[PDB]
Structures are given as structure tokens and as C-alpha cells.
Design a protein around this ligand. Structure first.
Ligand SMILES: Nc1ncnc2c1ncn2[C@@H]1O[C@H](COP(=O)(O)OP(=O)(O)NP(=O)(O)O)[C@@H](O)[C@H]1O
Ligand SMILES: [Mg+2]
Ligand SMILES: [Zn+2]
Ligand SMILES: [Zn+2]
Lengths: 325, 48, 247
């Protein structure tokens, strides 16, 4: 059958499996002629019924739409005479990767630089009416040259800029638990750009704490951890939180006080970084800071000013003896 | 055949289904019921 | 050439894939509108938006500039196209719901094979397979801009009467069904062609903006009065070749 616009994946030669996913999920590979490094991501279809996953279709549609210095880049869509493969520009590391490796060091100036790219990338995708809906350190890659790239739009979708009329009804159970904001845990279905800024807030802390600050085991345990950290979820700090169905039908400690800047005080130190982490991890979406303001917040415009990730990337060594000698 | 605001997002667009059933009557008005009756009735096009 | 990928010359439309398999020009052109009718039928049955329909058609039209009606019966292809189109325009319908309405329309006579038989399950796959071929043939390019956008926008701008408005939008739905302009001109121009036409019929001469541009200059900058007359004449001749033009 003719197929002028969907090349065989043979043009690329597989070199390695990226991570511990399934048999042939994600592959590191190179273009046989230009040697260009790419990452092959197989469109998974073990669940076959509604034909090509509408989730895969949303990914593709969104990725083909989003072109920005800080958004992973889809090169092309290939096939094997059957599987469909998304081909991206290869990025050497992922933020979750660097953060876990406590032997890799982050200067204050370099963290400012990572948050700036992350938020400039988020400003972009929201601007283009898209919600990421799966922000976490693992979906944030960083290229060998120090450029941050938002990745994993497998759960993204478009949203409507309707300040005007009717209420939107978007899928509610989204965003990995440890990074899910309150509004979604309380049953919110008409959400927006703020669910990603919450996630941008957890990843920011992890920049210093080196690991997820709120590891709930359940939805109720998560809200719990959030109340014990941000303060209790009340109509005083978050007006109308009452209305939510589950607001009542859910255990909900009510005496808790905000301890954000305290609990993190140990790790972070710099005042401006504390203030931002404070304005990002705000319970009421309508009051939670956004990418536009976060970017203009003093943290980014005060000494030390943001720097490139050259240093931080040199602390990432080739092996044992380099790391331990 | 009926103007829909393009400004509305995809999921916010009304169903195409015509309000009333399609009749077998041929006439300037029954031929202009919907977009199927106009293509089939008035212009005489059919897929089967 | 990426933006010019799905736009063809009168010659290219002539040397189609269906042509290379002995199908005749007006033979092809009919399958197109036929397919476009089936799509408009099932789509109103399933109550998928007009937009889901228009997109299903543009997939159709492009699918047949690479593939031939010979090998892919426009009645097999149309269900799959609409199936995929549903998801794409965020109003998905269940594979089964569709295999139903597709059967009601191509076989009002018979009755739906058992949801357990070999023939049923069998076809549920043929549809799925086809959607995979439609996806690879369109090169996975799914976002379709339609004439209806620029049409609405423009009428609102010239304060066209309710009747001219509806009529211009009606002609854009038809240019999709009847002509292949979708494969030759950008949506904004086709929208201009539809307003220029509904205007002839209304004998309305849209006023020329105070010491300046003509109405079509607020819809597209490459449009010329000469073009709009040629394409309008071209659209009408198409309308004159339809079957019924030959309570
Ligand atoms: N362009 C890329 N370059 C290098 N590694 C990549 C690239 N894209 C994805 N990866 C790796 O694949 C993992 C991301 O997979 P991802 O794109 O998020 O699909 P996912 O299924 O949603 N996540 P996962 O379940 O971990 O595979 C990342 O955490 C990276 O380690
Ligand atoms: Mg991921
Ligand atoms: Zn009708
Ligand atoms: Zn009648």
C-alpha cells in the first residue's frame, strides 16, 4: 500500500532502551544518514477496542501544534510495516534523574535557571490553550546543552478560555497523585492552567529537598499531607470551597496552619525562592500564582541572577570511580 | 446548513442531527430540511 | 511544500490515483460527493457536530489523492474516516455505535449481525485497520481549518443580513460536499467564494470600505475579483451537473 507520508522506522537504528518500561516502549536511536539522535516512543495499544487511542491522537495533535524552545519536539511519526512510533529530538537527562542522584550539585543560580525555563515553557502551552496535566520531575527533560524541555503530553488536552458562559467538564482524575493540586482531589472538573502551576510548585521544592514533598498513598492521604503543609482547607482561605460535593464526605483535618516556608526553610534558604514556592503552593487556584507573574517574581531578578546549566551538568559523572574518587 | 459560532471549542459544538425526522416528501421545503435532504432530494445524490 | 502538501494543480487532480486504475474523472468526482453524503448521513445519525462532519470529508478527499477508489471503496472508508474524525474533534462515538449506523445506512434491509458472530467481530477489525491506513495516508496530519470560520467572521463584519449569513455558511458546507476546492484553495479563499456567491443571488454589492479595500480584503489578501468570478462560475457548473440537473 502507498504511504508517502509515514516513513518506516528503519531509517533509524535502535541503540538502547530508555528506562525500565515495557518490552519495546521507549528507545534511544540514531538516523542512519545524519546520525541525528532521537527517541522512539511506541504508541501503546494493548487495549484495543476504540481503535487508535484517542489519547495518542491528542498527544500527536498537541505536539504537532506546540513548537517552543522549552517543549519537547516531535520530529515525525513513523511506522513498521504493525506499530506507530513517535520520534522526538533526544534529550540526555530528565529532571527526576538528576535530582535523585545526590552526587549532582545544583547552585542557587542554576535552579533559578531551571525554574525559568520550566515556567516559560508552561506560559507557552497555556497560551496555546493546552493543559499539561502530568507535571512532575520525570516529565521534564534537560538536553546535554542545558535546555529544559517539557515532555509527556500523553495526558494533555485543550481547554476553553471561557470567562464567559457555561461550565466545562474535563476528566477529573488526572495528574500523578503526589503532584495533584487540591481542587482536583476535591472533585473539581472545570479546572485550568493552575493545576500545572501547583505541579510546578512541587518540582520547585524538589529542586532543594531532592524528592517529592507529599507522597500520599491515597487521595485522602494526599489532601491530608497538603493540609498538614499548606494549612487546613477552609472557606476562609479558599472561598466557596464549601460547594464541592466531597468537601464534606471526606475526612479533612481542620486545625492545620500553613507551614510551607517553615518546613522548607531548612532546605531552600534564599527568601525569594521561599516566597515563590509559597505563592505556587496555594490552595485556591484563583489565588495561586501563574507563569506570567511567577516569571517576573524577584526570585528571577535578584542576585544571584540565573546562569546556564554547564556546571551542574559536569557534576554528572561517567561512573563509580569518578563519582567516588 | 445552520450557522454555528466558530469561536466555540470542538466539544462545545451542537450535534448535527436535525430537530425533526427526515420525510420522504419532495418539495422546495422538504428538500431543504437538512443537509442530507438537500443533497439527496434536490440534487439527487445517493451513496447506495 | 509542507503547507503545500495537500493542495494540488488542476493537472494533479486529473492524474489522480483513481485515474491510474481506469476510473474516469466524473466517475471519481461522484464517489467524492457520494462519500461526502454518507458521511453527512451517519454523522447526523450519531449526532456528531457539523465540524466533525466537515473534517471527516477533508480526510476523505485527501485520502483519495494518495489512494484509489478501486482499492478502497468509499463506503468502507467513510465510516472509518468519521470514526477517527469524532475523536479528533472531541465528540468520539463508540466503535460499535458507529458500526451500527454504518450498517443502517448501507444495509437498511438486512439486520445487524450478532455482536458475537465471526462476521461482526471480523468487520470491527476492518474498520480499525482502515483507520490505521487513513492515519498513515494523511501522514497523521489531523488538524483541519474550514471555510466556515472565515465565512462567519466575514458576514459579521459586513453586517450581512441573517439570510445572507446563513446562505454563505450553507454554501461552504456544499463546497465541501460538491467541489474539491478543499484540495485547491485555502479555506479563507473558499469562504470568500461562498460569500461572493450568496451575494450574487441576493444581488447585494458589498460597499467598498471608505477610500480603500474591498470586502474580500478583510478575509484574504491573495483574493482578486477575477478569481471570485471564475471560482463562482466553476462552482455553479458543478451544481449544474448534479443528477437532478441533467405534506
Ligand atoms: N526525547 C526524549 N529523550 C530522551 N529520553 C526521553 C525522551 N522522551 C521521553 N524520554 C524518556 O521516557 C520517559 C518519558 O516517557 P514519557 O514520554 O513521559 O511517556 P510516559 O509513558 O507517559 N512516561 P513513562 O511511563 O515513564 O514512559 C522519560 O521520563 C524519559 O526518561
Ligand atoms: Mg512520563
Ligand atoms: Zn432532512
Ligand atoms: Zn413537504
Amino acid at each position: 500500500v502507498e504511504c508517502p507520508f509515514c516513513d518506516e522506522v528503519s531509517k533509524y537504528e535502535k541503540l538502547a532502551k530508555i528506562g525500565q518500561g515495557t518490552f519495546g516502549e521507549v528507545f534511544k536511536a540514531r538516523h542512519r544518514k545524519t546520525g541525528q539522535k532521537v527517541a522512539l516512543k511506541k504508541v501503546l495499544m494493548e487495549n484495543e477496542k476504540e481503535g487508535f487511542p484517542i489519547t495518542a491522537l491528542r498527544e500527536i495533535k498537541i505536539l504537532q501544534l506546540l513548537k517552543h524552545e522549552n517543549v519537547v519536539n516531535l520530529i515525525e511519526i513513523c511506522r513498521t510495516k504493525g506499530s506507530i512510533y513517535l520520534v522526538f529530538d533526544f534529550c540526555e537527562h530528565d529532571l527526576a534523574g538528576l535530582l535523585s542522584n545526590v552526587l549532582v550539585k545544583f547552585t542557587l543560580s542554576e535552579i533559578k535557571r531551571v525554574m525559568q525555563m520550566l515556567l516559560n515553557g508552561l506560559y507557552y502551552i497555556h497560551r496555546n490553550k493546552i493543559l499539561h496535566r502530568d507535571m512532575k520531575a520525570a516529565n521534564v527533560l534537560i538536553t546535554r546543552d542545558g535546555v529544559l524541555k517539557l515532555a509527556d503530553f500523553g495526558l494533555a488536552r485543550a481547554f476553553s478560555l471561557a470567562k464567559n458562559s457555561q461550565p466545562n467538564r474535563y476528566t477529573n482524575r488526572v495528574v500523578t497523585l503526589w503532584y495533584r493540586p487540591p481542587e482536583l482531589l476535591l472533585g473539581e472538573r472545570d479546572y485550568g492552567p493552575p493545576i500545572d502551576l501547583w505541579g510546578a510548585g512541587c518540582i520547585m521544592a524538589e529542586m532543594w529537598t531532592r524528592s517529592p514533598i507529599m507522597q500520599g498513598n491515597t487521595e485522602q492521604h494526599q489532601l491530608a499531607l497538603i493540609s498538614q503543609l499548606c494549612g487546613s482547607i477552609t472557606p476562609e482561605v479558599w472561598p466557596n470551597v464549601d460547594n464541592y460535593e466531597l468537601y464534606e464526605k471526606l475526612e479533612l483535618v481542620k486545625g492545620q496552619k500553613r507551614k510551607v516556608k517553615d518546613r522548607l526553610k531548612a532546605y531552600v534558604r534564599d527568601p525569594y525562592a521561599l516566597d515563590l514556592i509559597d505563592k505556587l503552593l496555594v490552595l485556591d487556584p484563583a489565588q495561586r500564582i501563574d507563569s506570567d507573574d511567577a516569571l517576573n517574581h524577584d526570585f528571577f531578578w535578584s542576585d544571584p541572577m540565573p546562569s546556564d546549566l554547564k556546571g551542574m551538568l559536569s557534576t554528572h559523572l561517567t561512573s563509580m570511580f569518578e563519582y567516588l574518587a | 446548513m445552520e450557522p454555528v459560532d466558530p469561536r466555540l471549542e470542538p466539544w462545545k459544538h451542537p450535534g448535527s442531527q436535525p430537530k425533526t425526522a427526515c420525510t420522504n416528501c419532495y418539495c422546495k421545503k422538504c428538500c431543504f430540511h437538512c443537509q442530507v435532504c438537500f443533497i439527496t432530494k434536490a440534487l439527487g445524490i445517493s451513496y447506495g | 511544500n509542507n503547507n503545500k502538501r495537500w493542495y494540488f494543480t488542476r493537472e494533479q487532480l486529473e492524474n489522480s490515483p483513481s485515474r491510474r486504475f481506469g476510473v474516469d474523472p466524473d466517475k471519481e468526482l461522484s464517489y467524492r460527493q457520494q462519500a461526502a453524503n454518507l458521511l453527512q448521513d451517519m454523522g447526523q445519525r450519531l449526532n456528531v457536530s457539523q465540524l466533525t462532519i466537515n473534517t471527516a470529508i477533508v480526510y476523505m478527499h485527501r485520502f483519495y489523492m494518495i489512494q484509489s477508489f478501486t482499492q478502497f471503496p468509499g463506503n468502507s472508508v467513510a465510516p472509518a474516516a468519521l470514526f477517527l474524525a469524532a475523536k479528533v474533534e472531541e465528540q468520539p462515538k463508540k466503535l460499535e455505535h458507529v458500526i451500527k449506523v454504518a450498517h443502517t445506512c448501507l444495509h437498511p434491509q438486512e439486520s445487524l449481525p450478532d455482536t458475537r458472530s465471526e462476521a461482526y467481530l471480523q468487520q470491527v477489525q476492518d474498520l480499525v485497520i482502515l483507520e490505521s491506513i487513513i492515519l498513515q495516508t494523511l501522514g497523521f496530519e489531523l488538524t483541519i481549518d474550514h471555510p466556515h470560520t472565515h465565512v462567519v467572521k466575514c458576514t459579521q463584519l459586513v453586517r450581512a443580513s441573517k439570510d445572507l449569513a446563513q446562505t454563505s455558511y450553507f454554501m461552504a458546507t456544499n463546497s465541501l460536499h460538491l467541489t474539491t476546492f478543499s484540495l485547491q484553495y485555502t479555506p479563507p479563499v473558499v469562504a470568500c467564494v461562498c460569500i461572493h456567491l450568496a451575494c450574487k443571488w441576493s444581488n447585494w454589492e458589498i460597499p467598498v470600505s471608505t477610500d480603500g479595500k474591498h470586502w474580500w480584503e478583510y478575509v484574504d489578501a491573495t483574493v482578486t475579483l477575477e478569481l471570485l468570478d471564475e471560482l463562482t462560475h466553476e462552482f455553479l457548473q458543478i451544481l449544474e451537473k448534479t443528477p437532478n440537473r441533467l405534506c
